[PDB]
């Protein structure tokens, strides 16, 4: 039960992916819907408007799914590699009330990436039953930048 839910394939549409904010200027728009694993082109990742531990990227499955893992990736803009080292994960059924992913009575801090190109697969044990998913970058290199994939089934 570790099938891509549609981040890379775009089975999860752009409108399903949202964030706390995103970085936009004259030349680049690092929109939330660009947070798709292995995405190509320019500005090929999500970046929040500012770098703090309270920024989040949201995926609405529009349907309760069984999430058994997430895969994360950074990105390299020119000479600057950008990626998140650690993150939290929260979920919701209505998209308004949120709950952090606890493990062994303690809120789990997942270990993310060490570079801008290698995907890192983090396991979600116990598996998550949720319609909404949120990822919360806690520490990062250079800038918060994210391409991801959700793994599981229905």
């Amino acid at each position, epitope marked *: 039960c570790s099938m891509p839910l549609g981040m890379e394939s775009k089975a999860i549409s752009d409108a399903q992916i949202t964030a706390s904010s995103y970085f936009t200027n004259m030349f680049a728009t690092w929109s939330p819907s660009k947070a798709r694993l292995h995405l190509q082109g320019r500005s090929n990742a999500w970046r929040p*408007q500012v770098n703090n531990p309270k920024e989040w990227l949201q995926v609405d499955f529009q349907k309760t799914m069984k999430v058994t893992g997430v895969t994360t990736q950074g990105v390299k803009s020119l000479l600057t590699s950008m990626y998140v080292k650690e993150f939290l994960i929260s979920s919701s059924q209505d998209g308004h009330q949120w709950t952090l992913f606890f493990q062994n009575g303690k809120v789990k801090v997942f270990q993310g990436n060490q570079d801008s190109f290698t995907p890192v697969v983090n396991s979600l044990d116990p598996p998550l039953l949720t319609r909404y998913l949120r990822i919360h970058p806690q520490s990062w290199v250079h800038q918060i930048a994210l391409r991801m994939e959700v793994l599981g089934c229905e």
Partner: antibody, heavy 122, light 107 residues
Framework: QVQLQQSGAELMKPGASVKISCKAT????????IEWVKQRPGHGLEWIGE????????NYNERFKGKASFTADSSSNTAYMQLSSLTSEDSAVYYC???????????????WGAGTTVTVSS | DIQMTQSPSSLSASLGERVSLTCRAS??????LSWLQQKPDGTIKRLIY???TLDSSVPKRFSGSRSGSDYSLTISLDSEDFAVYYC?????????FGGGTKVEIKR
């Protein structure tokens, strides 16, 4: 009724240490960052750092790296800040407050403790 | 670190008078700014969050705005409004406060 109850005034001799507490009620203690803030008498507010009780994750202002240390007891829903090797510069009032772990809510810095006075003197 | 500068730092106005305080961030903070009120007893209350959103338990005569990169707290004045007001930046770490503005009532 979200409230934050801080410890009473405290007195310690210079070079020693004090451990003041922030008790939370009225919400899920584990899922909000506890912030700690310093104010020297006559001066303005200064951010010390924060702790996320649910995970025990911390973020410190570089200025307080060697001075301040945060802990949290989730059984009593109480956060603690210990200040080490006290100098006269550490004589101040210390406030705790709160932020959401995610942006977009109304919870950022919403409730403040009444403050705890720390006096460094022999 | 992002530096917050408040002006005028010291202010004296009469009752019913309209007042305004100003925070200028040394960097882009993208409307991640809070306004705080501290009374002489040491009590701290949140007035504004996210630049311009009123704290629900705060009088409507208080409001926040911003013309980048200048953030403003405005009171459209009461005798209860004498206090030191702080701006708080939370766009990036470490969090940084403005120097503070002391608002005194003219009588």
């Amino acid at each position: 009724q979200v409230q934050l109850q801080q410890s009473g005034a405290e007195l310690m001799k210079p070079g020693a240490s004090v451990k003041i507490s922030c008790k939370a009620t009225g919400y899920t203690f584990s899922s909000y960052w506890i912030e700690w803030v310093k104010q020297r008498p006559g001066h303005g507010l200064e951010w010390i750092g924060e702790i996320l009780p649910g995970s025990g994750s911390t973020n410190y202002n570089e200025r307080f790296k060697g001075k301040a240390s945060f802990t949290a007891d989730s059984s009593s829903n109480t956060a603690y800040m210990q200040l080490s090797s006290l100098t006269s510069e550490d004589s101040a009032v210390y406030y705790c407050t709160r932020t959401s772990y995610y942006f977009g809510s109304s919870y950022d810095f919403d409730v403040w403790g009444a403050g705890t006075t720390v006096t460094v003197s022999s | 670190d992002i530096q917050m500068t408040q002006s005028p730092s010291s202010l004296s106005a009469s009752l019913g008078e309209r007042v305004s305080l100003t925070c200028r961030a040394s960097q882009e903070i993208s409307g991640y700014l809070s306004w705080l009120q501290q009374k002489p007893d040491g009590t701290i209350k949140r007035l504004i969050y996210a630049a311009s959103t009123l704290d629900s338990s705060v009088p409507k005569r208080f409001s926040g705005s911003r013309s980048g990169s200048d953030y403003s707290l405005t009171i459209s004045l009461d005798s209860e409004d004498f206090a030191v007001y702080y701006c708080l930046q939370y766009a990036s770490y470490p969090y940084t406060f403005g120097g503070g503005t002391k608002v005194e009532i003219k009588r």
